[PDB]
């Protein structure tokens, strides 16, 4: 009624980088919320109102499945609905359109606040944050970070209870393959949450043996992981490398080598997915923030604490798509998988995000070849950067 | 040797696809590949506006354009509009092809060829003599008046001039095939083209030599049962560079999606095209039939098709959008295949540092912003 | 009752293994296991070293053994092309029926459901080929016979899908109308004897046709660059085709073709004649005399009237003359047509819980035997 | 010569891995030390006697480029031709027709008595023990292993131009990439000598620079190597898996996790070549033997010393292959080229060795499918095991 979806429109002069194809000479109809059709350029009817991209590039919305913060804010820092909106639109221009808020290591009461606001948050808007990211607090602190040692902890059966009973909002937890918590992994995984490997010490052994118990991802390969030490000693990297599980790496040159990223690229294949882990650093200009009490500095891109310990990183998905394709070598289709199909089929959104296709939401982005977002469409709304 | 800079453009080198990059020419080569932000100061860019940059396309196969036929005047004059109408769709270099008629129109075309060969480089190439040791039920449009066997009088003469031959397209079941090694000898591509044969003796003849094959599936036996597979299967079964034209008309899109399929990077577009390309004209005499043009369609009288009005460019949107060949693979159909097929990439047809800066720029909806043939920049 | 078989290598359909032993437990494939782990006490069947597959399945076979379907309708028929298949590593195949009059159609759906009540996973449904066909690629078939389906028998084969497995006829026939109805009785829809151009055969296939007859033989051809034919339209389709590899039927560079374009689309069958498996000199089929002339079977006018070749015979062509490689090829001769009619849930690869259908073979393909139901039998 | 003259024979009924095509139904004609033809059996001239192979499988020789001793010996032990004669002949039970004598860091008097030994023994003997391997001493002590810290050193001048006046008997020579005298690495490729990286704590830039130099290969990968011990520390496994190099690795499931070999193979395809690093154990029934002074133990399949220390392998090129193709998960036609082809090509002998073509030399093994050698020709000599 009033048009309140919208009149249909259509995208026009665009490359559409759909997941599965590269498309030259189409037009991509969004109806309301949806995808409605890919039909060719010069068969759009003349009434619909058309977005010319200029010849541009258009591809499903990115979706960041570890984000501490950005624009300014951090969630741990403070947890509301306003944090959340605040990160919403600063993904936006860097073309992410969905995301999990990452929560970390902390006291149980900001826990159950994050739950709190999240499912408040979740009777609002739909297919933007999608659900929590706990990573830790059931941790290691053989591999804690920037995460606080006396906060890393197993967790209670009564802890375990609320996670379980509250995972309708909950998307991912993070956790250390050798930590106690370990022995749910079989629950986390029956009620819908993911459960992914990091800040873990863990032998080859015990990551595969929390892979078996259904650990289905891991968190910013590399950081914070028991590494391949030796020939005979392949740690947790060497578990998730030689597994058929989704895994997050950063890309920002900071975090892993570029030739480390080209590797595990050749190893992983189309199970290797784009995170930022950004902070309030990305999409804002700061000289530092808190991470759970802990001052973390930014200088020169970086963000790391008084003993150079990184603690997040200042990057957005559109400058780590420039770094897969200038940096790593990966063609752009495949990097653009990497930050929208890939993590969506890694959480189980796939049927109705993460690429183009008829009929999925109208999670969408445009961007140049030097790699500037020119907007996005949000449930088929369309907002010019 | 003036120097100067592409820059803001996706550069399609034909093993790479680079983006943040700029493209150095220095006089006519392809001096340096750099990061955009470290090109000197001191040169002029052409700023391609995020286009795309790749190697000057190579059209194997080309009768006429611009409204001129190289048949119907031979001169240096006809060969110079057809590479300037070539431009416009990207192509900065081709074979003039001059098809099927007596000899003495052949020798005045080698004249010809060699008198623009005193004068330009890495243009027109050579000649592609298409006929006339052809055969009669594999005509097409050539006249079969001069369908015939070669002499040893007009072998010497062809192997004498082979400096300017670039390519010979004869059917294997003519007894003109018994020449192909000496052909090959003096350095002439033998292309299977206008045939009829069995596939034996189609593949006799890539045996003793032949090594490329005539707009694939158009005046060839075709594979006509599992028992028959003709010249069509001879092509399709052995390792040797092929042409096929991408007009929609000449060759069903669904064929070039299974020939692609089986053929891979030994695959190469042409445009077989006449002076219909790259003009507004109705019909056009070829060797003195008269060939009608309706909606991108060259025929004759019986709706034999006699060339094509098509454009590289033009060929490179139907591979994409029609056949679904990636643009990367499709763009390496139209200079480095080509290239490779007559033996010219150590110079041309990709984008390497040291070979010769013949390049064209081009937009994702498939129009061509500009050429630089021997590094001479030109916007269309 | 249980044992193994060890000392071979096993060729999965998704793996090649070495040091492995097969567990066979009644009828299913019961474990793969570690050749030292195999108990001792346990039976085992030492194939010394050769191969084991799962059992090949033929989706086109006249007969063999020295007799035809059509020509001897019977129960008995049945298994004496069952028995004869064993020796070739064909564990099920699909007992095909010609164009013919109706009666005789009729009386081969009473003798496969009777067949049936006795004998599981073996020869496993009716293929119909016509005579719902084409009189220009009639092939052999009878001119007189080929015909467009009445109201009343596309009544009969609907009723009776569950003992038929596929139907061929061709694409411009107007029995090509009840493809959707075919299809949602459980009848595999396949084209074969058409002259019908590209476009109308890829009008049945969007109607649910999903396999195409012995590709090139009877049908139209990629006669030009612009006419593609039945041939153009099954290469250029994602449907399942079955193809002849005896070296007569085509060409051995049109399979190399055809292989490159379908990928595991591409199933081998027979089309063998009561020639195969035996020492005959010449037999009647639907009143055409077909001469056999060194593996050769052909009617005075010289036109094929059906094959020779065995699947193990095809396996080592396919491997040596075509140049597929071993495990592709098997996959070709099980899984695939597994796939194409829809028995790869209990038949066509070794994996545990499967039926117990397999072949052991050598290296210059002789078979050594086979399980059906996991009762072993050597050659 | 009084030896047997050279003549024609054919092989039958065999599977022939000709290491591009796995052929059936053919016959392999040899002639003199030469492949001859390889044609359909059938058409085996009829006057030829005939290796009937009996349906198992034909290969080119193994060629095994880091090899100490077998069959009782140590070549840093007992430096003679009649050391390098029983090592061969050893090598022939398990299908290695071409090998490296590996000497390990050593006196300089050693190493110049290993130069005479080979010179002499290459007079007397083609396609067989090809040249010398010098595995150290220019290593670095961290990385050290085996061989004694008090013999590990830097190059002198003199000892430079010796070994590159002898190029002509030195195949390969492994050093760490910091060690001092990376600095002839130029020097000693111009002279033909394999340059290999190996027993080198270096860091990922310091190795990656003795690969722009020269350095060609790896020795046994993971084994005495920096590892990629973090995102941003790739190590000498790093620089060699990031880059185009052949390397070595040690398939005795031992010195290295057969995931381990998985991943690897993944990363270098084509460049990953399967070596021993044996020694007397192999191909005998010893306890322990003499390694430079130090007693090395033979214990289930581990070669050690008193305290320990891995001293060498206890394993054969086709128990290799079969760890390879049963363990690691390799095909059987990709894992013989890791033993003939790969290895031909990283010390360029692959114009003569390594391949079943036409006019190559008839170096061959036969082999059954559960891994016994059969027998072995060598320059065309068949020898039954
Ligand atoms: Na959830
Ligand atoms: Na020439
Ligand atoms: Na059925
Ligand atoms: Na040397
Ligand atoms: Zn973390
Ligand atoms: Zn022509
Ligand atoms: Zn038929
Ligand atoms: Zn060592």
Not at 22 to 26: A, E, I, P, R, S
Not at 54 to 61: D, H, I, R, S, V
Not at 190 to 194: A, D, F, R, T
């Given at each position: ?20 194809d ?5 037009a991509?109809?969004?109806?309301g919320?949806?995808?409605?059709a ?6 759009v009817?003349?009434?619909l109102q ?14 960041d499945l570890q ?7 951090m ?13 919403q639109?600063?993904?936006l221009?860097?073309?992410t ?10 006291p149980?009461?900001?826990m159950?606040?994050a ?6 948050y ?6 933007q ?41 909950i ?6 393959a050798?930590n ?9 995984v ?5 459960v992914?490997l990091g ?10 043996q ?59 294949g ?5 995170v ?34 990184l603690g ?8 780590s798509?420039?770094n ?20 969506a089929?890694?959480?189980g959104?796939?049927?109705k995000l ?32």
């Open positions: 009624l009033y048009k309140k979806a919208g009149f249909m429109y259509a995208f026009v002069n665009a490359v559409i980088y759909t997941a599965k590269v498309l030259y000479g189409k991509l109809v969004v109806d919320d949806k995808i409605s890919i039909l060719p350029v010069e068969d009817p003349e009434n058309k977005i010319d991209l200029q010849g541009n590039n258009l591809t499903a919305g990115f979706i984000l501490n913060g950005c624009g300014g804010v969630f741990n820092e403070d947890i509301s609905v306003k944090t959340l909106e605040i990160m639109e600063t993904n221009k860097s073309g359109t969905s995301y999990l808020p990452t929560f970390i290591t902390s149980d009461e900001g159950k606040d739950v709190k606001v999240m499912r408040e979740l009777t609002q808007y739909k297919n944050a999608l659900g929590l990211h706990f990573e830790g607090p059931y941790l290691s602190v053989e591999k804690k970070g920037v995460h606080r040692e006396e906060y890393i902890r197993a967790i209670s059966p009564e802890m375990k209870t609320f996670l379980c009973d509250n995972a309708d909002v998307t991912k937890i993070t956790l250390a050798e106690p918590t370990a022995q749910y992994i079989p629950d986390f029956e009620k819908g949450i993911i992914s800040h873990s010490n863990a032998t080859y052994d015990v990551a595969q929390a892979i078996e118990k259904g650990a289905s991802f891991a968190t910013h390969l590399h950081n914070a992981m028991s590494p391949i030490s030796s020939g005979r000693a392949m740690g947790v990297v060497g578990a998730v490398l030689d597994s058929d599980i989704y895994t997050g790496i950063i890309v920002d040159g900071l975090h892993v080598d570029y030739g480390n990223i080209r590797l595990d690229k050749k190893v992983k189309d199970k290797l997915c784009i930022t882990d950004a902070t309030a650093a990305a999409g804002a200009d700061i000289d530092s923030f808190v991470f759970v009490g802990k001052t973390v500095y930014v200088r020169d891109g970086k963000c790391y604490d008084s003993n150079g310990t997040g990183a200042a990057i957005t998905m559109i400058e798509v420039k897969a394709v200038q940096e790593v070598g990966i063609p752009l289709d495949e990097t653009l998988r990497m930050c929208n199909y890939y993590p089929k890694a959480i959104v796939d049927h993460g690429s183009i296709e008829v009929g999925k939401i109208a999670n969408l982005t445009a961007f140049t070849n030097d790699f500037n977002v020119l907007g996005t469409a949000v449930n088929g709304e369309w907002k010019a950067n």
